[PDB]
Every structure is written in C-alpha cells, then in structure tokens.
Ligand binder design. Structure first.
Ligand SMILES: Nc1ncnc2c1ncn2[C@@H]1O[C@H](COP(=O)(O)OP(=O)(O)O)[C@@H](O)[C@H]1O
Ligand SMILES: Nc1ncnc2c1ncn2[C@@H]1O[C@H](COP(=O)(O)OP(=O)(O)O)[C@@H](O)[C@H]1O
Ligand SMILES: Nc1ncnc2c1ncn2[C@@H]1O[C@H](COP(=O)(O)OP(=O)(O)O)[C@@H](O)[C@H]1O
Lengths: 433, 519, 523
C-alpha cells in the first residue's frame, strides 16, 4: 500500500477515544457538586486561572483530541439549551464509554450496545416523569441552603415573602420569578435581628403622598431626572414643593418604572421588595447579604421550573434499579447494554460522595437500598426518594430538605450523554492524510 | 552491608494479593475449557516422553505441579473435593478464580481484604439455604419405576455421542451394571474392556470379572473350560520352560550328574506345577507368561491355566473370587483359592476371553465394547463412565438440582436481589459473588461452540420470569429446562463446591504476605 | 586515592555519616519488622503464605512462627525479636505488642531526632513514661478472675486469648482448653503448660476433638493386651527384627537348609531377647521403629504390652515424664533405665484406638487434648492457639488481675501518660507525649485489620474516655466503626501481659536507640 498518510483500526482506536474521554471527565470529576475543589488553568503565556465550576473549565480547557472535542461541543449544546448539568453529562458519558469498551472486549457489538443505551435512556425518562413533583415547607426549602443559619425561621421567612411578592405573569400567563427585583442592602443597627422586609423599591438617592410619579430622562412631586438638574431649576421645585431628585441611575429608573427613611449614611427613598440587613459588624451582615440571594434563587428555580426532581443522586440511584430490572425483560443482547447503563449513573452519587469526604461505597449502597425497598412494595415503612447529605455525609430525604433540580436537566443530561457516547462509540477507524 | 533480608525474597500488601489472584486464574485457564462432557482436551508430557490426553480437571491438576503457592492451595482444595464428592474439581477451581477476578478492581480501589471475606461467608450461607430450598427429592415421581428415570438420565448424558443411535441399548446395560452391585456402590468396582471390530449392538454385558486374555501359548484341544465350582488360583509366578526368572545353572564334571541337573531344572517347574494341583486349583490365573509345557500339564490333569493377566484384573478377581494373591506356590491353600458358579472361555470377536460368574464376593462386573476402532471404545469407556456416575449418584442422593448452570443463575438472581437490600460494602461484593456464578454456564456455551452472550442473556431473562431450573443445553443451541430433561446433580455436591470455592477464595484473599526462608 | 570514604574505617562497615543519620537506618529495619506483623493483629489478622526451610507451605497468623521462618539478619531488629523471645517467658502472649509498640516508639523517636532532641533525652523520657505506665496500669484493672476453677469461669477468660489466633472456633476451644487446665490448678504451685501435651490426629474437624487424661497417643497398641498397671516401662528406638551383634557376626547363607536355620535363628533371637523383657517384669514396651511379625507372637507369648510410636518427640515425652530412656540396642534388659507409671491401657475414642499413660495412685498432673482436623496445616495452627490459651492461665496462677482489651487500655494509658507529659517541664515532655502516641498504634492496627478507618476509631475512643467511660474498646465489625464496652462483651487481657510487654518493648527500643553505629569484626 502507498498512501500520503496513515491508517489504523481495531480495539485500540475505540479504547483511545475511551481513554481520551475519561481524561476529560477526571479533569472535572472532583469539581462536581457545591464542595467541588478548585482547579488551575495555566495558559501558554504563564498566567493561571482558578475556579471550581465544571462548565467554566470545559470552555477554557484545551485538549488536542477529536473524541475530547465532541464532549466540549456537547457541553456547549447543554449550556445554551439549559445552562446547567454540563459536568454530569461529561462524567456520565465517559463512564458509559468505559463500560461499553469492556463489553466490546466481551464480543458485544457496538450496535447492540448503542441499541441498549437508546432503550435505557427512553425508559429512564419515562420513570423520571412518573416520579416528579410539581409546583406546590417554603420555610424549610431555603433553610437547608442557608452564619445566617443561627436564626433559621427569622431570615428564611423573609425569603419566602420576597420570592412570592415578585410573582407576576408578564407573558401569556407564564408566571416566572424575575431575578433583578429584590434589592438587598445592609446596616449595623443594634443587633442582627433588626433586619426588616420592605414591600417596595428602595431607591438610594437624596432630595409626600402624591400618586404622580414623573419619569423623565432628559437633562435640565416624586420627580426623577437621569440627566441631572441645574442649580437654578431646583429653586422652582421648592416653590411648588416637589420632591425632585437629580442624577438618577438608569437601572434604578427601569425598576422604578416597572415598580410604579433614616438609614446609616445613605437615606433611601422608599416607594410604598427589599430587605435591609441591620447587623452588628460588617463581617457578619455582609455574608448574610449573599446568603439570602443564594437560597432565594434556589427557591426561585423550584417555583419557576414548575416540574422538578430530587437531587443529590436520588434520580441516578433509582434508575440504576429500574433499568437493571427492565433489562431482564428484553433480552436479545440488550441486557448488558442496559445493565451497564445502570452502573454508569451511580458515578454521580459516587463522585459527590468522594468530594464530600465520605465512604462512597457505603453511601451509594445505602442510597440504593432505600430505592430498592421502594420498588418491592408501596408500603410507607420502605423509605422513598432519598438523596445524599453532602454536609453531614449521610442519606437525606431531599423532598423535605428542599434539594431539587429542573426536570429538563436530568432528562436532557441523559439524552446528551447517551448521544455523545453513541457518537464516540460508533467510530471504528482512524484515517490520516 | 548489614542487610535485613540478605537474599530473602518477600513482598506484602495489595501487590501480593493481586499477584496471587493472577496466579489463581492461570490454574483455571488450564482447566477452563475442560468444563462439560464435550469439553476440549489437554495434552501433558512427562520426562518419559509419553503424552496424556484427557479433559479431566482432577487428573490435569495432579500432572501440572505448579510451584506458585497460591496455586498449590487451589490444587489441594481439589483433592478434598475428590474425597468429599469425587468430582467437581473443575467447577471449584474455575469458580474460585472468578470470585477473585470480580473483587480484583475493588481490592485495587482500597477495599480491605477482610471486608471481602465477610461477603463470601455471607453470600455462601445464603446460597446454601437456597439450594436446600430449591432442591427436590425424586423417588417415585408419578409412580414411574426408578429404572425408567435412571435410563433417561444416562441417555441424555450419552446423547449426541458415538453411541447416539444405540444409546438406549447402552442406557439399559449401564443401569443394569450399577444394579448388579451391592448397597455400597463404587465406581472403581466396575471394569470396562474393549474388543476391536463389530457393531455397537454386539457389546456384551458381563456379569462377573473378565480380562482381555492375551494368553496365546500352546495347549489347545484340551483343558475343559467349563467348571461348576472351580478353585481359582491367584498367582504371579512364571511357569515358562526356560524362564527368565527360574533357572538352574549347575556346572559339573560328570555326565551322569548332568542327567539329574537337566531333570532338576525341569523339577523346579514340575514341583511348582504339582503344588498348584496339590491344593486342587482348577483355574490358574498368573500375571507372568506361562510356557507351552505347563499348558500340557494341567491339560492332562483336567485343569485350566492361562497367564499374561494384568495386575488390575487379578486384584479385581481377588475381590470377586474371594481369595488372595500369592506370588509363591508352595503355601497355596484354600485361604487364597476362590469360587464361582460358571467359569467358561468365550470367543467373543474371535479372540479368546475368560470370565467368572456368580462368585461369592461378586461385587464387580465388566463391560465389553464393540466398535470399529480403538478410539471409539476409548471415548466410550469414559463416556459411559459419566453415565455410571450419574446413575450411581441418583441412587445415593435423591435430592437434586438442575444442572447446566441452572442453579448458578438462580443463586445469581437471589444473591443479586438480596445484595440490593444490604446497605454497606457487602452490596457490591455479594453482587460480584452473584455475577461470578455465571461463569459455569458461560463456559458450557463457549466450550460447546455456542454464543454464550445470546444464551446467558436469554437465560437470565427466563430466570427473572420464574424459571428455577432452566439452563444450558449442550446438544441444541437453545435454553431448555434441565430438570425436565433429567439432567440432574446432587444438592450436596453443589453445596460443597461453593463451600470449597469460597473457602479457597477467602484463604487467598486473607493472605497479605508471602515469606520465604532461604534454605 | 583521596577523597576517602566518610567514617568507613572498620572492616568496611558502612558508617553512615551525620547527614546520613546512622540511627535512622536501624529504625527503618525495626520499622519494617512491624509492618510484616502489624497486619497479623487481632481476630481480623491477615494470614501469611509462609514457605518453610524444607520447601513446605504453611499458612498461619502467629507472630512467633513468622519470625522463626523469617530469618531476621539486621541485629537492630534482632533486639526486638530477642525481646519477643523474652516475652514468651513469664507470659505466652503479647508478641505482636512488643513488635508493634517498639516500632511505634522507634517511628516516633525519629520524629524527635529530626527536631534536634538528643538520643539520651529520648531514652530518659521513655524510661520515665514506662514507670508512669506501670503506676497507671493497676488503676485500669477493672475485674479479676473469681478463683473458682470452674469451666464456665475459665472458658470465659480464654475466649480473648484463643481469639486472634483461631477465629470462629472461639467457643469450642475455650471449653476444650478449660477442661484440661482446671484439672491441674488444684495442684497448688505445680501447674505447668508442659504437662498439657497436645496430640493431633487427621480427622473430620475441630468439633470432633475431645479432652483426655494422661499421655494420649494415636498409634494403637500393637500387642493384644488391653490394660496393665506395670510401672516397669522401657523404650527401644531400635526396630524389632532379627538381632545382630555389634561384633562381626557374619552370617553366610549358601543353601536353602542354612537359610531356614538362620531364619529360625532370628526366631530364637527375638524369642530370647523378648524373654529378657519379661524376666525383668517389664510388661510395657514402646517401639520407635517397625515391628516384626514374629515379635507380635512373642509379645503375646510372655504377655507384654507392645506399643508403636514412630515419632521421636513422642518418645522424648516419655523419657522426660516416666524416665524410660531410648537405648540403641535390641531390648537391653536394664531395669535402671526403666520408667514408672501407675496405670497404662488402651482406649478407643472417636472410632480410634489410642494408648494412655495416666497416674491413678500418684497425684498426677498430666493431660492431653486430642485434636481432630481435616487439614494438617489448619490443625497445626490450632495447636499454637492452645499454647497461647494454656499459658494465659499459667500466668493466672500468679496474681489474678485482668484489664480491658480491644485497645481500651492503650487509649486510657495514653490519656494518662499525656497528662504527666504536659505537667513535666523540660525536654522530657516530647518523649513522654510520643510514648503515649506509641500506644495509639495498637488500636490503629486493630482497626486497620478490621477494614475500619483508623482515625475515626481513635477519635471516638478519646472522646468517651474523656467522659470517664472506661472499659470502652473497639467493636470488631467490618461495617460498623462504632465502639462498645469490652467488659460486658467479655473481652479481657492479662495484667502481666501488658506489664512485661511494655517493659520489654521499652527496653528493646532503648537498646536500639543507644546504638548508633554497627561495626563488623573478624575473630
Ligand atoms: N445542595 C445540594 N445538595 C446535594 N447535592 C447537590 C446540591 N447542589 C448540587 N448538588 C449536586 O451537584 C451536581 C452538580 O450540580 P451543578 O453544578 O448545578 O451541575 P454541573 O456540576 O454539571 O455544573 C448535581 O448533580 C447535584 O446532584
Ligand atoms: N448433559 C449435560 N447437559 C448440560 N450440562 C451438563 C451435562 N452434563 C454435565 N453438565 C455440566 O457440566 C459441568 C461439569 O460436570 P463434570 O465434568 O461432571 O464435573 P467437572 O467438570 O468438575 O469434572 C456441571 O456443572 C454440569 O452442570
Ligand atoms: N475478639 C476481639 N475483639 C476485640 N479485641 C480483640 C479480640 N481479640 C483480640 N483482641 C485484642 O487483640 C490484642 C492482641 O491479642 P493476641 O493476638 O492474643 O496477642 P498478640 O497480638 O500479641 O499475639 C489484645 O490486646 C486484644 O485486646
């Protein structure tokens, strides 16, 4: 043979794409979950970027390999479509290729493996849709996510009122929960208990029960001017008695347009949500600011994405049992493909357990035991819908603890992971020019 | 300079267990293909240069003599299995290594060896309780005679063989040969002999002891073969004229003395000939050859004699005639002489054959084979031996289970479903224990040329639906109920296999270091 | 040729320089010795695939058996081995204690020498902490043996010694060993482990074993005599056969006539020699070799009870028990070299005929545990567990004081020693505090061998011990890292076991620390 390039095939090329995909997963395996470890990204210049976000790593990571590039393009599709779950997709796909490569060594053709993954993903989505929970403890929801936790019901009760006040349709009876509607601030007034909820917009400006709210942008009683007010023009407002203000921020007027006190060193013009955090010192109250915005969004993602599902590996542990039993019903060389699909899902609770510094073999076993007892009989003595506690390191009913995710994430993450494993596993040759 | 080991080799930890696990697989690989009746053979050669060809896992491991000590433990476990059962050495060695193969990656992941032992001891006990639960006793199933079911068992084991068409004829004689023995059954008591040429139907079922009778010396037209109550002599003496053993070389210087020396050398044969007749032995069966002159002696005295008998046939006649072997002939008396109802020379296949019948200690028999070649009779020798064991074990133990890996898949189902309801590290280990049981039916498919993937997957589905006895069919490439097919094995044999297999894996898994005293 | 070798001046002995830290090399050799035996600790100890000097494969978990076959060559490690041999005297347990604890002291001493502490300051601190340990250890004595000689009492205490040497058979062996030991404690101040001679027979299993009085031997009586109370006993290692003198005695056999005559001469010689036995009145004889068929007739002719013991060590027991010595010639009629025994008879136990030598008239303290087993390897390992069990109560003939087990004492003793280390000012606090952490290596090994996280176990023990909840040790369980009370569970060690082990382990480590350079010498 005489050609201007190279050529190669066999088991080594499928294994090369498997060993390549496994390397990308290990790069973002330990960074999975909220307690994920940080990772460095050393560019060719010499600079260093440090972060723990799996999506950010894959976007900036560079690995010269065709199979690895498929997972990079894969994460982009899952990101633009949903914007979450790119780390679990890359890890689940690598495990399927690992187990698939083992089956191919057992004389199991890839087309039989591919036909099984298409069936396991299909029934898994049916089982997911059968055990969902719809929009319906809102004091216990943000409590688990939330130093602010010393007073649980006090700070958390203000969060459920903030997230509920923003409820508004705004499209065809859609109602969502907008993000930039709450205005969290802070103070140091006499305690950490004096924090108060406000059912109105807190405008940080300085100079009435007049319903007329004037909104103007051009530059010269509740009159707002973004372009500023000259010195002489303020004298005319004193004649009529208007509470006119100059140099109004653009972003504030948009909220004031959509919308329509003695505070330490910056008196806010209140229109009559927001929560001003009166604390003791800047160290305590500053952390409480972000702590409220964090758990408020978790409750927001639950009430927005009306359909949700328990997180913490509860889905992956249940599918591991159902798909293992469904496999015996089919036969026809699809058992090992569907059965290996079940073990691949356990990587998510196995990876999260290792990141939480716990015995993953114990927690994953304890997690599968409760889910298996749910399938035996529907009695209430059998535990159901159990997840993982990453803080304490033990099982936890995520239905009560308030740990959920959108249904489209867990559903599409298996569809994208299955499509990528099929795309890499269908390859059986390498041709270079 | 002042070194601690000083040539002493020693290693410990995970590298030692993983090293012993790989050595255990090497012993299974030498007997992996021998599993089943249609399994591939192995050729072994010793320093003499002679080749031994057989698919017997027990005989193969005895000939290898591997130096690795982890392998010596597996081979030693096979010897205890022989004394306990007499078979199942391939299953124990093959299945023990499968437990080690499945727990290999978990050992590498840092799981302690002691945690692995707790799973094997637990899953094994749960499996033994399930064997006794699924095991069924069959004595009078549907009021059918036991001889009928026992023939269906031997026919299935001999099906798809050289005697496939005439398996019914061989099925009857195999059961009849086993029925001819006493309560204390034994495989070594029955002999199997081969006779070249002829059809399969001409194979004779001898009631007593017989031998090839390579005796081809003179003395014909005499020696009345029939005897009603003869006295059988068991000797190893050579009565040749010019015997390699017995001679008399007396040098003298007198003609008259030579007449006595030539007669004295003759007297040594005659005195030995008379001592046999002195006690009254009607049948002289000697290990060594006999000369033409000694044939004429007993031919005139109304007595039979024929040497060139193998040692095994004599000792098999020792237990049959009820006497004893006596190398000498001077002290020959009734204490070693035998008895029988009918001793007659038969010309089956043209060659001469001697046999006894109706002896007092007649605890043995003989199976004569007729075929077109020697290998047809050598394969049939062991192929019928398998059916004789099946018929024997059914009489001893009536509690049985479905063979062909049928019970291995139910235990794989029960232990796998039980492991799901076990929180802790025992879940993955008991599940691995379950998956290791599937190697027995997987090799029965591979050794039979079938696709183990398609059968083992179809078979696992039938077990989930409720099939408690379905297994592998060596003849047809399909799933079949081995219980209805009368392919049975005792329940205690399968218990002692798992116990010996788990005990062997636990002993290897419990090992951490190998110490070697330099000497 | 310059530059020369650093400090190498004595027979080419490698003298590791100051930067090379010659003391560290000896610590590494003793450190490596512990790692071989650290895994053989407790009931979950990992067995060793030992290869004897005769190319024999034995599997065991005994520490002394490992060191015998493991030819230790580094003399620094031999000091700890010699301490283990001294640990075998005055007590029959705690061998791994001397190895695991001494290695922990040497391991932690290297941490101190790296800081800069002198070798003498570390030695003085360990010797001080050893004294505090001997003062704290009596306070840890929670319960003691009730001194009743009851099989229920004795079996309860032997469970801890038999465990960690043969797991699973803890229940049977505790009762079997108890039945043989309680039969001698009435002999005040005369109990000896040497009196309990263990004999092992190939059989079904350990459950088929039993206990018997006197010196039991598996080989049945070759003669036809059942029982005889003849004290005149004589052992003849020479096999019974045709007699031959130490002189020339050239027997020339030419014709068949002379063959039968001298063949009958052997009949007269054995009849004449066996006659000499009965002339002295010795109706009991023990053979070391084979036995001739004609001698069996002469044995029954004069009514002499003939016994065949082919093992040499079986004869040495008789030579040291009754006194009958093994002479080289064919039955020397020497009454002086004969023994004494009050009762001798054959007995059938477990479908097996066994000879018995007991003392009916005399007081007697001899006993024997007839072991049964399918595998000689596993059966020989059960013998070593019996000696550790019998020797446990040979110590209790002394002051009967027990302490908790499962690492409970090691944390309670480490907690108290760390207190004195904090109060004691100066540089001794470092070696005293590390002496307490050396005790933590015991439950760390006990937890590691059980498949449990070590640090998770030590944290729980120090927590409950801080609450005053003494007697709390490690719960042997593969999945459960929790703890439990060792007293209520019935796990108890011996006081003198920890005393002599802590004393010898400290001296073994101090003798290694005092050494700083190993030198070769030619005679
Ligand atoms: N509060 C929590 N409790 C338990 N598990 C969590 C929690 N938050 C996130 N996880 C787990 O972390 C995993 C990754 O979440 P996320 O970071 O949103 O996706 P990705 O890691 O793909 O970017 C999820 O599979 C989820 O089960
Ligand atoms: N006729 C048969 N049909 C299906 N399987 C069989 C048949 N005969 C034997 N086997 C299987 O072959 C295996 C090995 O049998 P055997 O050769 O007697 O023991 P070993 O292989 O240990 O010597 C058994 O596990 C049994 O299930
Ligand atoms: N079943 C058990 N449970 C808890 N601890 C045990 C058990 N058996 C032994 N141990 C502990 O193991 C230690 C060592 O026992 P042993 O093996 O008899 O001595 P050595 O290890 O020195 O040979 C003892 O101090 C005891 O506390």
């Amino acid at each position: 043979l005489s050609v201007f390039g190279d050529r190669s095939t066999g088991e080594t090329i499928r294994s090369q794409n498997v060993m390549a995909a496994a390397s990308i997963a290990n790069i973002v395996k330990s960074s999975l979950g909220p307690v994920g470890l940080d990772k460095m990204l050393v560019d060719d210049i010499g600079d260093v970027t440090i972060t723990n976000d799996g999506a950010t790593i894959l976007k900036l990571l560079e690995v010269e390999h065709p199979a690895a590039k498929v997972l990079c393009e894969l994460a982009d599709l899952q990101d633009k479509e949903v914007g979450d779950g790119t780390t679990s997709v890359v890890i689940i796909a690598a495990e399927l290729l690992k187990n698939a490569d083992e089956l191919v060594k057992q004389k199991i053709h890839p087309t039989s493996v591919i036909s099984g993954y298409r069936l396991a993903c299909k029934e898994a989505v049916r089982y997911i849709n059968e055990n969902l929970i719809v929009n319906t403890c809102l004091i216990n929801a943000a409590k688990t996510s939330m130093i602010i936790g010393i007073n649980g019901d006090f700070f958390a009760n203000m969060v459920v009122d903030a997230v509920l006040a923003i409820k508004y349709t705004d499209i065809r009876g859609q109602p969502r929960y907008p993000v930039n509607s709450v205005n969290i601030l802070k103070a140091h007034g006499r305690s950490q208990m004096e924090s108060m909820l406000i059912s109105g917009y807190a405008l940080n400006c300085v100079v009435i029960v007049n319903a007329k709210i004037a909104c103007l942008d051009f530059s010269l009683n509740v009159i707002l001017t973004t372009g500023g007010i000259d010195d002489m023009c303020l004298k005319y407002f004193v004649e009529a008695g208007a509470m006119a203000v100059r140099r109004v921020l653009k972003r504030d007027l948009k909220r004031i347009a959509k919308a329509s006190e003695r505070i330490c060193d910056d008196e806010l013009i209140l229109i009559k949500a927001s929560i001003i955090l009166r604390g003791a010192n800047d160290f305590m109250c500053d952390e409480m600011e972000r702590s409220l915005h964090d758990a408020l969004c978790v409750v927001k993602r639950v009430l927005e994405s009306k359909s949700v599902v328990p997180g913490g590996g509860a889905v992956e542990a249940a599918l591991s049992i159902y798909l293992e039993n469904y496999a015996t019903s089919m036969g026809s060389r699809e058992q090992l493909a569907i059965a290996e699909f079940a073990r691949s899902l356990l990587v998510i609770p196995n990876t999260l357990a290792v990141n939480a510094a716990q015995d993953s073999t114990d927690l994953v076993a304890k997690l599968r035991a409760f889910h298996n007892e749910a399938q035996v009989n529907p009695e209430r003595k059998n535990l159901k819908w159990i997840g993982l506690d990453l803080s304490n390191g033990k099982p936890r009913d995520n239905k009560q603890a308030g740990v959920f995710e959108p249904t489209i994430v867990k559903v599409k993450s298996l569809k994208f992971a299955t499509e990528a494993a099929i795309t890499i596993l269908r390859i059986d040759d390498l041709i270079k020019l | 300079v002042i070194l601690l080991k000083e040539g002493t080799d020693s290693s410990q930890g995970i590298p030692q267990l993983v090293s012993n696990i790989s050595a255990c697989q090497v012993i299974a690989e030498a007997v992996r293909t021998t599993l089943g009746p249609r399994g591939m053979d192995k050729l072994i050669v010793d320093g003499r240069g002679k080749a031994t060809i057989s698919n017997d896992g027990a005989t193969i491991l005895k000939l290898l003599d591997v130096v690795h000590p982890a392998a010596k433990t597996l081979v030693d476990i096979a010897k205890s299995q022989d004394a306990e059962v007499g078979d199942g050495t391939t299953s124990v060695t093959l299945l023990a290594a499968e437990f080690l193969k499945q727990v290999k990656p978990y050992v590498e992941e840092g799981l302690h060896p002691q945690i692995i032992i707790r799973a094997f001891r637990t899953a094994t006990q749960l499996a033994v309780n399930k064997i006794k639960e699924i095991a069924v006793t069959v004595k009078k199933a549907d009021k059918v005679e036991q001889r009928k079911l026992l023939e269906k068992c031997a026919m299935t084991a001999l099906s798809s063989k050289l005697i496939s068409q005439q398996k019914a004829f061989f099925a009857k004689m195999v059961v009849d040969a086993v029925m001819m023995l006493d309560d204390l059954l034994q495989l070594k008591m029955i002999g199997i002999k081969k006779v070249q040429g002829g059809a399969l139907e001409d194979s004779q079922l001898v009631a007593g002891v017989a031998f090839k009778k390579t005796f081809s010396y003179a003395g014909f037209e005499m020696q009345p073969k029939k005897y009603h109550n003869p006295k059988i002599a068991l000797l190893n003496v050579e009565l040749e004229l010019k015997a390699e053993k017995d001679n008399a070389e007396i040098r003298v210087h007198t003609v008259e003395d030579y007449q006595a020396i030539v007669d004295a050398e003759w007297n040594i044969l005659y005195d030995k000939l008379e001592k046999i007749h002195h006690s009254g032995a009607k049948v002289v069966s000697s290990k060594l050859p006999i000369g033409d002159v000694a044939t004429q002696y007993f031919a005139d005295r109304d007595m039979f004699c024929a040497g060139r008998v193998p040692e095994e046939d004599l000792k098999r006649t020792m237990m049959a005639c009820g006497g004893s072997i006596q190398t000498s002939v001077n002290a020959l008396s009734a204490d070693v002489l035998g008895r029988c109802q009918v001793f007659e020379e038969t010309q089956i296949g043209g060659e001469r054959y001697n046999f006894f019948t109706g002896c007092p200690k007649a605890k043995t028999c003989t199976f004569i084979l007729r075929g077109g070649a020697e290998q047809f009779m050598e394969e049939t020798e062991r192929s019928l031996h398998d059916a004789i064991m099946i018929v024997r074990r059914a009489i001893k133990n009536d509690s049985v289970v479905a063979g062909g890996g049928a019970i291995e898949m139910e235990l794989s189902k029960y232990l796998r479903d039980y492991s799901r309801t076990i929180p802790g590290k025992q879940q993955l280990l008991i599940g691995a224990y379950a998956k290791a049981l599937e190697i027995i039916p997987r090799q029965l498919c591979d050794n039979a040329g079938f696709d183990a993937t398609n059968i083992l997957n179809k078979l696992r589905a039938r077990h989930a639906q409720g099939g408690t006895w379905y297994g592998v069919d060596i003849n047809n490439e399909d799933i079949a109920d081995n219980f209805e097919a009368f392919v049975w094995e005792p329940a205690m044999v399968r218990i002692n296999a798992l116990t010996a297999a788990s005990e062997a894996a636990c002993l290897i898994v419990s090992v951490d270091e190998t110490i070697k005293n330099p000497r | 040729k310059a530059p020369g070798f650093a400090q190498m001046l004595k027979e080419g002995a490698k003298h590791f320089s100051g930067l090379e830290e010659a003391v560290y090399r000896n610590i590494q050799a003793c450190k490596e010795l512990a790692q071989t035996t650290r895994t053989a600790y407790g009931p979950n100890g990992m067995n060793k695939m030992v290869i004897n000097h005769l190319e024999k494969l034995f599997v065991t978990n005994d520490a002394a058996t490992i060191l015998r076959e493991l030819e230790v060559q580094h003399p620094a490690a031999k000091m700890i081995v010699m301490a283990s041999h001294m640990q075998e005297q005055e007590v029959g347990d705690g061998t791994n204690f001397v190895l695991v604890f001494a290695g922990a002291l040497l391991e932690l001493a290297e941490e101190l020498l790296r800081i800069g502490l002198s070798v003498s300051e570390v030695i003085e601190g360990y010797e001080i902490a050893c004294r505090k340990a001997h003062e704290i250890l009596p306070n840890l004595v929670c319960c003691s043996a009730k001194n009743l000689r009851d099989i229920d009492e004795v079996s309860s205490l032997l469970r801890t010694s038999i465990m960690s040497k043969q797991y699973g058979n803890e229940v049977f062996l505790a009762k079997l060993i108890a039945q043989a030991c309680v039969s001698i404690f009435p002999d005040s101040g005369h109990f000896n482990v040497d009196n309990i001679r263990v004999c092992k027979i190939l059989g079904s299993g350990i459950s088929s074993s039993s206990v018997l009085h006197g010196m039991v031997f598996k080989k049945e009586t070759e003669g036809d005599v059942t029982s005889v109370k003849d004290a005149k006993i004589a052992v003849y290692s020479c096999p019974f056969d045709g007699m031959i003198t130490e002189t020339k005695g050239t027997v020339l056999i030419k014709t068949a006539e002379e063959l039968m005559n001298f063949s009958k001469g052997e009949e007269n010689l054995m009849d004449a020699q066996v006659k000499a036995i009965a002339d002295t009145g010795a109706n009991v004889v023990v053979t070391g070799g084979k036995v001739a068929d004609m001698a069996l007739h002469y044995a029954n002719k004069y009514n002499i009870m003939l016994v065949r013991l082919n093992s040499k060590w079986d004869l040495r027991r008789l030579c040291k028990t009754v006194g009958a010595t093994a002479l080289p010639r064919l039955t020397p009629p020497v009454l002086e070299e004969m023994g004494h025994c009050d009762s001798v008879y054959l007995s059938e136990v477990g479908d097996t005929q066994v000879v018995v030598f007991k003392h009916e008239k005399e007081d007697g303290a001899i006993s024997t545990i007839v072991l049964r087993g399918s595998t000689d390897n596993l059966m020989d390992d059960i013998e070593r567990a019996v000696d550790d069990g019998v020797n446990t109560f040979k110590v209790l003939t002394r002051d009967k004081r027990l302490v908790p087990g499962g690492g409970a004492t090691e944390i309670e003793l480490a907690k108290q020693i760390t207190s004195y280390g904090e109060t004691c000012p100066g540089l001794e606090q470092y070696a005293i505090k590390k002496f307490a952490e050396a005790f933590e290596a015991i439950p760390r090994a006990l937890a590691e061998n059980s498949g449990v996280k070590a640090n998770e176990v030590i944290s729980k023990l120090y927590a409950v011990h801080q609450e005053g909840n003494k007697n709390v040790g490690l719960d042997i369980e593969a999945e459960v890292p929790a703890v439990k009370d060792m007293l209520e569970a019935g796990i108890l060690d011996t006081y003198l076991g920890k005393y002599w082990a802590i004393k010898l382990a400290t001296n073994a480590a101090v003798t290694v620390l005092r050494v700083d350079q190993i030198i070769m010498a030619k005679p």
